[PDB]
Structures are given as structure tokens and as C-alpha cells.
Amino acid sequence: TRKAVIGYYFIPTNQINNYTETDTSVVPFPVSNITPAKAKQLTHINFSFLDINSNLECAWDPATNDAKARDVVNRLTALKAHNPSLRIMFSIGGWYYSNDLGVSHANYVNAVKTPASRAKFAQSCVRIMKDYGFDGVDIDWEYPQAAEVDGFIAALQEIRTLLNQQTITDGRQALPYQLTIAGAGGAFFLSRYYSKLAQIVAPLDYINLMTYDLAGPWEKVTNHQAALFGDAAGPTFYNALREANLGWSWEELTRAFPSPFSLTVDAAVQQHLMMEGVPSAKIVMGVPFYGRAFKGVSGGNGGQYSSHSTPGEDPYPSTDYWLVGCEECVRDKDPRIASYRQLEQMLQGNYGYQRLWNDKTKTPYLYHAQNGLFVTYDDAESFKYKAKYIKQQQLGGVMFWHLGQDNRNGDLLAALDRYFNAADYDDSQLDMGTGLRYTGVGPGNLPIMTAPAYVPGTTYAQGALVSYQGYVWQTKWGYITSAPGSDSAWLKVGRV
């Protein structure tokens, strides 16, 4: 089955209100950049972002010119003429509106609080969808805290119910309306709802992992923001999932959540697969179409794993635009981020950037020896390893943030489509390397194993293996006289 290629596409309200397809000075990446050929390379475009207003319903930012907005959305849905599998989804949330300290946080917390609020919200989601011509709903709340989870889940279940009814009502069996969420791609935020992953994922077509922003100026050591695998020389982190309210034993938690560990794209994926009821087909790996830059880094490793002097707060707490060659950073007043389009332009100019490659994390990085700068980003090469990983792990596809940051030629999007679908691309010999793999084991990814059936009345020594209730178990200490599941001396270690 074809892999999903989901491109979030972010158009700030100012660009909607002053939309133009002929002045990259006002709208740097307008819809017209998405040619028929590019429309065919995508399976989904997630228009970003809608929000949740104080009436606790899905709605466009209050400052939005509703007519320009409907027009921008129409240009997107018009792309469907070139790709019958294409869906224009809309995404609600995003960091700005929904983070704990964000402008609309309260609205998310309250919208899912009651059966009544949940019903009114779910209904506004479907109404907005049908009114603007969207093909599905993506929820990007970063992130419901542990207490708000059961409500978040109920809300997704209600939306699912309404969308399924609408699909039938609209004769959309061929292209059913969909419901997805953008999920954490790092253990710290994932720990908030991890214990209920199966319930969160059940009503979704996909869970889009934000497997990026895994490094940034808010961290003391420079690092790759989307390493596929770990580099023993890089920083390691506390495994937050061992603290999730999972109700597992010390032994179970320790083998599922090694700590510290390498914060990588593979870690996030494996962490989701470890849970029962989280099918690999619904997991979508996110990739960044932008890089993060750090200043004041020292040398010796190309800028990797170095202390730095980059402000970590938002907004950028200064007027010093130190990312040499980044004119976009001047336009957006933040030298800590740059689109792949801009990065390429910086490389093409002589600004002193050396493009380096880490063969463990399988990602590129830039090093500016003169001014001590380090930029972590992704490109068509790192996408080869991620695309192969998606195939090997049988994931649903790839997602990216965000379309408008690709170069004019659409090279990043083209690469992604090529790796999954081109008849003349062959990655059979691509070597995944020796970077660190996340090795945790959980209920959802137990190894197939065989062992003698447990025999009631038998005494087992430490380390013995038996099969019982369709699982393979191992005793944690000796002289075990009770059965697996009824005696905590037994550890589930395999399946079948």
C-alpha cells in the first residue's frame, strides 16, 4: 500500500490577509508553487493552523480575512484535480496557540472537558471541514497534560464517529474523511499521554510524530535535531517514559526504558511500537524542512556537541542577526531557524559554511569555523535513510514541517516521493550504519519465542522460560511455585 506523504503547509494570518502569488516578499511560498507534478508527490496537505476559540469551537484566527482564507483553501483543494488520492486536511493547534503557555491553551483544556463541550467541539470540527471544503481533521495540541487525556480521547472518538457518518452521507467511501493528530516525537512530552497511546491512536488514521526539534538553543549542548540513530559521542537524556503511569514493575520499566538514552527519530518510533494496540501502519515519521542554528560554538567536532551562546527564549530576545547569509532570518527576526530553501542559498554563496555529515545519526550539519556557528538540518540524503527506515519498520509514511520551506524546485518533497515510489530508485544496498538503536522491549514489540508449556505443580529455577496464555515468560528469581500472571516472579519476555 502506498506510503503517506503528509506535508503540513503553514500560511500565517498576515499572509492569508495579504495573499498574493506574485510577490515572494509578501507570501514567500504561495499555493501556485505547488505544481501538478508536486501535487502528485503528496498524499496529504495539512493546512496550518486553525485554532479553538473561546466559544470552545474550531475556528480560524479572529484576525483572518474569511474571504482570502476561503480563496487560499480553494486553491489548495483545486490541486485535487491533479491527484485523486490527495486530501487537503486542516490542522488545529500548533505550538503557538496550544502550548501550555500559549495564547489559546485554556480553550483546548475546556473544549474537551465535558460530553457537552466535546460534542459541541467535535461538531464544529466537521462543520468547519465541510464549510471550507477540507478532507479531514488533524489535531495538533502540544500537549494535553495527563489529566486532560481521557477527555482528549473522548473528543477524538466523537470526531471519528461524526466523520464516519459524514463519509457515508457524502458518498466518500473512495476517499474517506480522516482524523489524525500530530504527536510528540520525544519522550519528555510523550510521557504526558504515553500510558494511553492505544486509546489515543484507535480513532485515528495516523499519528504524525514530530520527530524533530529534538535539539535546540534551549539545550546546553549543540546536537542534531532529528538524528535517525544515536551517536555515543552526543548527549544522552533521562528516559521520561519510565515515570509514566503505566503500572509496570521495575523490571518491566527498566527493560522498556533504558536511561539515559539517545533522543533520536528511531527512539520515538520504537517507543510507540512498544505499546500494545499501536499498529506500525498508523505511525508516520515527521521530518523537518528547516534547520536550527547555534552561535558561539567551539571546534573539534564540526560544531557538534559543543557549549554555545545562543538565546533559547521566544521571541528571539535580541536584534543581533548573526546567521551569516540568512536574509530570511532578517525578514523573520530570528537567526536560530532557517528553511531548507534558505540553507541551500547560504551554501551556494561563499559565507564560509562547510557541509558535514554524521554517519551514525545519518544527518547533515553545517559548520562555520570563522564565526563558530552550527546548524542541524535534514536534506535529500538524510531522507534516504529515513525513507528506508519507514519501509523496514512498516510505518504508515512520512510527514513534514513544512511545505513552504522546501526549495523552489521542491527537491525535498520530490526526494521523499522518489524513495517510496520511483521505479528506478533502489535502496536495497543502502547501509543503515552503526548508530545506536533504541533497544527497549514492551508489551507491543515482544520477540516471537518458543518455550515448554507452563506445568502447574512444577517448581522453576531462576531464568526458566515457559509459554503460558500465548506468551513466553521468564522467572526473575528461584524456586518459583506459582503460574505466570499470578506470581510476580515471572517476566513476559516473548510472544506466541
Place this chain on the structure above:
Amino acid sequence: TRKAVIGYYFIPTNQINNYTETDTSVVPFPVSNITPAKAKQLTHINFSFLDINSNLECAWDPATNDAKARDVVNRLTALKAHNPSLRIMFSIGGWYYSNDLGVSHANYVNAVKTPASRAKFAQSCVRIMKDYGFDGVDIDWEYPQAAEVDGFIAALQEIRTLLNQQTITDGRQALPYQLTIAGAGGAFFLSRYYSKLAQIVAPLDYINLMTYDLAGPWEKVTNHQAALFGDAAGPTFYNALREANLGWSWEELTRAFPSPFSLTVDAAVQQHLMMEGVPSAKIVMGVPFYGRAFKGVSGGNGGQYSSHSTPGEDPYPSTDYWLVGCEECVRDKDPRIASYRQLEQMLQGNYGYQRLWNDKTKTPYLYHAQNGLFVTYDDAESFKYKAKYIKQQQLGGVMFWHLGQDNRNGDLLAALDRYFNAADYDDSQLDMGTGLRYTGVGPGNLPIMTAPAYVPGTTYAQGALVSYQGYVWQTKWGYITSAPGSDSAWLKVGRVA
């Protein structure tokens, strides 16, 4: 309040049926050995053991001659004329009858299953108690598994209700009928019901901890079976409590249950004290009146912490009675265990054993350099430290297995009574040593802590401390913007005054 001194008194069915007080080869330790002076040294005698039958009722083993049984029990209750505080309890269970593979295990499991089974079983306990003249009931089931614990708790609560009614009916308010249980003294078995300890202990007057058998030939390294404190040179074990169904986070389990740890008497007592709702006054520390022997031991360290060649299975598989001087072992056909009485005689018979002392564990041991023998046991000196620990930790008292293993003079019982009640015994200067203390901290025994109240809308750095809803909490990582209590970012580390 007087410290309890609870002596289990084990007399096998065969000894009951052939009971005599003039033939030590038939009944080694008759009730006649307990004089009025000795009776005053006890607060409880736990006659061992009655069982639960297939009818799911408390009963004597069917092979028991009933007249002979009443006669032995009368000799025990007659001891009450010499001590107005003394209670002759009866204990249901024991290892033989109640272990998972024991002969009557299914009866324990089934008896506690339903309101109806529990009522019937509980009424039979009171019936047996009144019929034979006992003063209370002790349950020694080794041990209920997780799924059976709720039934076990309800059964105990039912017995409690019936005993209290019986106390009123009998006008026994001066010496109320009591209910106790013998509980595990080591983490492996304790993990079966640990999570519900408070509910199990609530209906009880005391929980008698079996803080012995912590070492034995079934273990690859020789060790003290009842070390009070740990010895860094001795073996350590995985702390099974980390696998109990507690619902605690990895950090809480890790902090509460250090691992590996030293399996000691102090560790069991502290593990019980850690749980909220378990009063120290109900905890009774057990001590053994017997030792366990190992052979094939190496020298260099008195035979301590060495590999050995001792059969670990029961029954003893051969006829090689290699514990030199232990004639009791020949009679009972097992050289792996000997009563204190016998161990004292072995030392007396000049058979080549050296009495050594571990000043970390505060326990004695025998080492036979010639034959390569190691014996772990307790004596009047190790009891001095245990008695001071009981006073220090404010425990309910001491329990011992078992009375019939003391020497003829009753020196071990007398030592215990002395340490708690003798006006001329003063342990105020007794040095408890530098042995390893167990210091786990669980959300059940948090220290009083002080920290600024939690400020919503604040972003906390890793390690920050705040007070919130009755507790002090610490962040386990950075940029915490969530409130304490709910999510996994905060660790409960203290209680707010």
C-alpha cells in the same frame, strides 16, 4: 506497655498421639519443661499447628488422637494460673500444611473465596478456640498470592468481628481474644501481598515477622539466616518488592527498594514500617531457636560467604549425617538443622567447632575448620541487639520459632524476658555496630520537607522543589510547565508540615 514475647510451640501429630513427659526420645520437649517461672516469661504461646480441612474449616490433622490433643492443650492452658497476662493461642498453617505445594494449600485458597466460605471458616476458628480452650487465633499461611489477598483480608476481618463478639459474650474484656498472623520476613515472599499490608494488619493485634531462614543450603553462598544488619562482605539480593503491584514510578520503586540489598532482620522490619498504615506497635520480630548447617565450606573467613556442597532439597536425600556431634540430626534424619539445645551440646562435647562472632550482623556462627562446616544460629548475645532494636524501633515485641528448641534450662526464653523486663539488665550503652542499615524511602514514609508553594504558569528547571497539595515535589527533568501530582515530571519527595 510490656513487650510481647510470643513463643510458637510445635508438637507434631506423632508426639501428640504418643505424648509423654518422661521420655525425651519420644517427646523431646514436653510441656512439663515450662515451669511457673518460665510461664511468666511469655505473653503468648502459639500452639502449632492446626489446619484447614477439605470442608474448608479449621481442624486438627485427622490422624490426631483427640483426647491426647486436649490433654496437651490443657497442660498449656494450665500455665495461665501462673501468669494472668498469658495467652495460649493456636496457629493455623505452617510451612508443611500451607506452602503452595503443601498438602492442604487448596483448602486455604478456597476457604477465603466468598462471604459464605469466609463466614463458615471464621466460625469454625472460634468454635475450635472455645472447644479446646485457646485464647486467640494465629494464621500462618505461607503465603497468600496476589489474587487471594483480598479474600485473605476479608477472612481476617470476619474472624476479628467474631472474636470481639465472643470477648463480650464471655465477659473477657480483661484478656480479649486475639488474632495474629505470621508474615514473611524476606522480600521474595513478602512481595506477594506487600501492596496490601495495611489492610492485612488492620484486623490484627500483631503481625509476627518470620525474620529467620534468610539463608539456607538452598542458597549458593553460606550466610547468616537472621543477620540483624548487613555485612558488605556477605551476599546481596535483588529487591523483589520492586516487582510488587504498587503502581509506583520507576524512581519511587528505586528509592523505596534499594537493590541489590542485604537480606536482614532490619530490612524486613523497615520494609514493613515504610508502608503507610502499618503501626510499629503491631510488628513482632521473630528470632530462631535453631541453626542451619552447611558442609563443603572453604576457610579464610570462618566459613562465612563461601560456596558449599549442601543438599538443598527437602526431605534430606541421603543418610550421610555429617554434622559432627548432632545426634538430634541422626534421629530427625537431617544434618542441615539443629535446635539451639543441640548446638549448645555440640559446643560442649568438644567436637572441634569454634564459636565465632560477626560484629556487623551481630550474630554468632559455628565453624568447623577440620570438616569444613558452617552453622548459622542465634543465641543469648545476638538477642541483646535484637531486643535493643525492638525497643529502639518501638516494635510490639519478639516472637520465636520455636519453644521446644530452647535448652532444658530455657536460657533463650529467659534471655528475651530479661532484656525487656529485668531491672538489673541495662543495655543503654550497648553498641549496635556499623552494619548496613536498610534505608529505603517510600511514598509511605516521606520525611517532612519544606519548599516554596507551586506557582502555576512557572517553568521549573530540573531538580526544583515545590510544595503542593500536602507534599513536597521535585522535577525529574527541565522546562517543567505542568503542575505537580498529575504528570510524570514530578517526584513526591516529602510531606508538608
